[PDB]
Amino acid sequence: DPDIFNRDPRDHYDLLQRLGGGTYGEVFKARDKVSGDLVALKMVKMEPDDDVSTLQKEILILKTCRHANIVAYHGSYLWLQKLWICMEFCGAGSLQDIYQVTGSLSELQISYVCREVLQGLAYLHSQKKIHRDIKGANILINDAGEVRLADFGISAQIGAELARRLEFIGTPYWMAPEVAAVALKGGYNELCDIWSLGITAIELAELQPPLFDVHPLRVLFLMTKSGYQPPRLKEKGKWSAAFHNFIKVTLTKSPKKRPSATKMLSHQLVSQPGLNRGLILDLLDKLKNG
Amino acid sequence: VVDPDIFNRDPRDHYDLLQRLGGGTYGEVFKARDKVSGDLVALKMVKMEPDDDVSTLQKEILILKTCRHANIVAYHGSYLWLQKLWICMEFCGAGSLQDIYQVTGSLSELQISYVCREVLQGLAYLHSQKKIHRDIKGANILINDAGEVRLADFGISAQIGAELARRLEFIGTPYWMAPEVAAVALKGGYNELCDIWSLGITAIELAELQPPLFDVHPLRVLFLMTKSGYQPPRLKEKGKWSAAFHNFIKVTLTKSPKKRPSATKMLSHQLVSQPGLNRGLILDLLDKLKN
Ligand SMILES: Cc1c(N)cncc1-c1cc2cc(Nc3cc4n(n3)CC(=O)N(C)CC4)ncc2c(N)c1F
Ligand SMILES: CNC(=O)c1c(C(N)=O)nc2n1[C@H]1C[C@H](C1)c1ccc(C#C[C@]3(O)CCN(C)C3=O)cc1-2
Ligand code: NA
Numbered sequence: 001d002p003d004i005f006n007r008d009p010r011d012h013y014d015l016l017q018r019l020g021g022g023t024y025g026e027v028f029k030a031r032d033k034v035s036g037d038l039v040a041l042k043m044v045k046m047e048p049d050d051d052v053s054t055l056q057k058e059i060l061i062l063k064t065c066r067h068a069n070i071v072a073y074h075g076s077y078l079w080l081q082k083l084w085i086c087m088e089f090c091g092a093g094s095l096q097d098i099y100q101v102t103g104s105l106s107e108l109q110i111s112y113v114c115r116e117v118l119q120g121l122a123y124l125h126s127q128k129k130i131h132r133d134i135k136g137a138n139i140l141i142n143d144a145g146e147v148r149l150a151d152f153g154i155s156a157q158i159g160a161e162l163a164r165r166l167e168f169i170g171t172p173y174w175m176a177p178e179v180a181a182v183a184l185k186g187g188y189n190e191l192c193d194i195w196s197l198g199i200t201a202i203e204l205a206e207l208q209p210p211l212f213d214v215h216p217l218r219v220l221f222l223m224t225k226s227g228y229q230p231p232r233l234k235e236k237g238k239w240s241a242a243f244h245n246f247i248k249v250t251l252t253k254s255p256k257k258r259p260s261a262t263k264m265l266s267h268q269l270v271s272q273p274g275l276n277r278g279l280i281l282d283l284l285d286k287l288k289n290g
Numbered sequence: 291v292v293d294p295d296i297f298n299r300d301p302r303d304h305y306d307l308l309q310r311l312g313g314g315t316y317g318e319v320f321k322a323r324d325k326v327s328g329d330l331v332a333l334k335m336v337k338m339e340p341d342d343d344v345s346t347l348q349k350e351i352l353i354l355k356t357c358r359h360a361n362i363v364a365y366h367g368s369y370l371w372l373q374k375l376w377i378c379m380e381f382c383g384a385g386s387l388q389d390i391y392q393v394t395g396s397l398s399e400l401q402i403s404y405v406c407r408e409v410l411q412g413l414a415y416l417h418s419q420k421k422i423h424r425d426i427k428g429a430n431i432l433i434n435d436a437g438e439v440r441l442a443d444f445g446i447s448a449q450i451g452a453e454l455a456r457r458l459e460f461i462g463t464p465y466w467m468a469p470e471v472a473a474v475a476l477k478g479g480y481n482e483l484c485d486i487w488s489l490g491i492t493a494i495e496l497a498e499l500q501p502p503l504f505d506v507h508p509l510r511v512l513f514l515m516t517k518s519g520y521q522p523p524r525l526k527e528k529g530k531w532s533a534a535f536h537n538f539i540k541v542t543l544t545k546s547p548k549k550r551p552s553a554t555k556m557l558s559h560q561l562v563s564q565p566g567l568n569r570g571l572i573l574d575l576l577d578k579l580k581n
Binding site for chain 1: 463
């Protein structure tokens with residue numbers, strides 16, 4: 001790929017500190033040596049006997065993605081078999097990091113977050129791209145209180161596996177149509193991000209998604225049973241009917257009836273006036289006071 | 291561990307390798323003869339390393355040793371020696387139905403009806419054990435010297451099991467995951483009824499010596515099955531086949547998995563329940579092969 005910078009990222013950036021994990025790779029905070037601007041660098045090591053398809057898909061996803069509510073992609077450096085993905089810096093970290101200090105968010109704060117994530121998802125889905133990993137840990141906040149979607153590692157893995165299973169599909173002349181549809185289209189569509197956002201709205205309201213106490217495998221099994229009920233907000237009178245309805249429609253069980261991102265953006269909870277980053281600046285102020 | 295019952299010895303202590311089978315189609319399968327008794331077996335060799343992931347093989351052997359049925363190829367055990375695993379199975383002199391019809395030509399309706407009944411019995415057993423074959427085809431249906439029909443090649447089935455095992459060990463935190471995504475993660479997006487469709491295609495293969503659309507690009511064929519107006523394939527020669535055979539093709543090739551009948555249900559279909567079906571039809575096929 002000619003877009004890759006074939007040089008050492010330390011040519012341009014002072015590495016400052018490790019910021020955490022992600023779906024794969026280590027993320028570093030760094031500073032532009034010329035402008036003094038801050039960035040984050042997701043470093044992915046490519047070891048000798050490694051399939052790099054997932055990494056290549058991640059770069060492919062980001063190369064054509066330009067939307068304010070998606071963490072900006074500035075490019076990638078390949079050096080000493082390490083790929084450094086350079087991106088926009090969001091100084092406050094993830095919402096999950098934040099609410100573990102501040103406590104649960106207010107309804108207006110959640111409404112701003114949901115509106116901003118929905119704007120990002122509409123753009124992503126308009127590119128036939130899926131996030132598939134929406135949660136508080138993947139919603140980043142910068143010092144201005146603005147909302148950014150991050151970590152496409154899961155998205156990239158899904159696209160690489162789909163391309164791989166397709167390349168190694170062999171002769172499908174005996175294959176049933178439902179198997180073929182799964183091989184080409186994966187078994188679901190972008191509306192899974194709308195459900196995840198509804199669960200995130202509960203997360204931000206209650207500091208954990210439903211059934212977080214339950215073993216992950218057990219949770220998978222419960223969601224596939226006939227009696228599975230979409231979760232609800234635990235405290236009824238704490239939240240408006242608009243918030244309850246938002247949760248109800250985003251958590252529609254059938255994907256055939258789950259509304260799209262663009263449709264959800266006309267929902268009154270996220271289309272109401274007065275939603276601005278200042279609501280999140282207030283949250284960041286709670287952080288600043290222990 | 292690949293299998294607690296592995297024989298930690300070289301199978302060539304006991305067998306002489308006589309010839310490779312499949313010409314690469316079946317992989318490294320070998321006709322082998324017992325050095326002492328002269329009994330013939332099939333040894334399928336798979337190369338192993340320390341770094342090699344053994345999950346698929348482990349699943350394949352688990353399937354073979356736990357799914358003993360009259361219509362599944364017989365499994366005699368596995369040898370591990372010098373980074374080579376050998377799967378020992380019964381030897382079928384005639385090979386697969388594809389081997390046979392490339393010599394004999396198209397099978398008769400009764401012979402195809404008998405194969406379908408026997409395969410459905412094996413599938414009904416497999417599905418009853420929460421197993422999916424997912425690669426039913428003429429090349430994977432063996433005919434032994436006694437004229438018995440036996441499903442084989444559980445490699446795709448093993449792969450599917452190994453993918454599910456890896457998704458669940460690395461499931462992470464699925465608390466934000468949508469129900470339809472959890473269903474695909476857990477159940478794969480389809481069910482054992484895909485095998486019923488594959489048998490319908492196989493019945494056409496045994497009658498015409500090619501599956502429908504064999505001359506169309508594989509990726510093109512895949513896409514067509516996802517288009518709303520996909521018409522399931524039919525038998526070419528209408529006049530050659532009975533109404534029951536056409537209807538059997540119709541029902542197995544129900545494109546909606548919600549309406550496709552199960553293996554046990556399909557066994558009460560008029561075609562595969564008719565009294566004229568007996569092993570002699572296949573022995574007759576073997577007699578034709580021998581001539
Ligand atoms: C079908 C198959 C798959 N798909 C994958 N892995 C193994 C087998 C598999 C093949 C067998 C083949 C034979 N015997 C014959 C006889 C002939 N062939 N093979 C082909 C050939 O080479 N000739 C020259 C024609 C006659 N016996 C037992 C087998 C067995 N137990 C298997 F599991
Ligand atoms: C103060 N700040 C951060 O703690 C930050 C930023 C930050 N920018 O500030 N990022 C992370 N963290 C931490 C660590 C972890 C959360 C993480 C994990 C994965 C990704 C990613 C990614 C991409 O797939 C590649 C490029 N791109 C636009 C993606 O989405 C970013 C981050
Ligand atoms: Na072979």
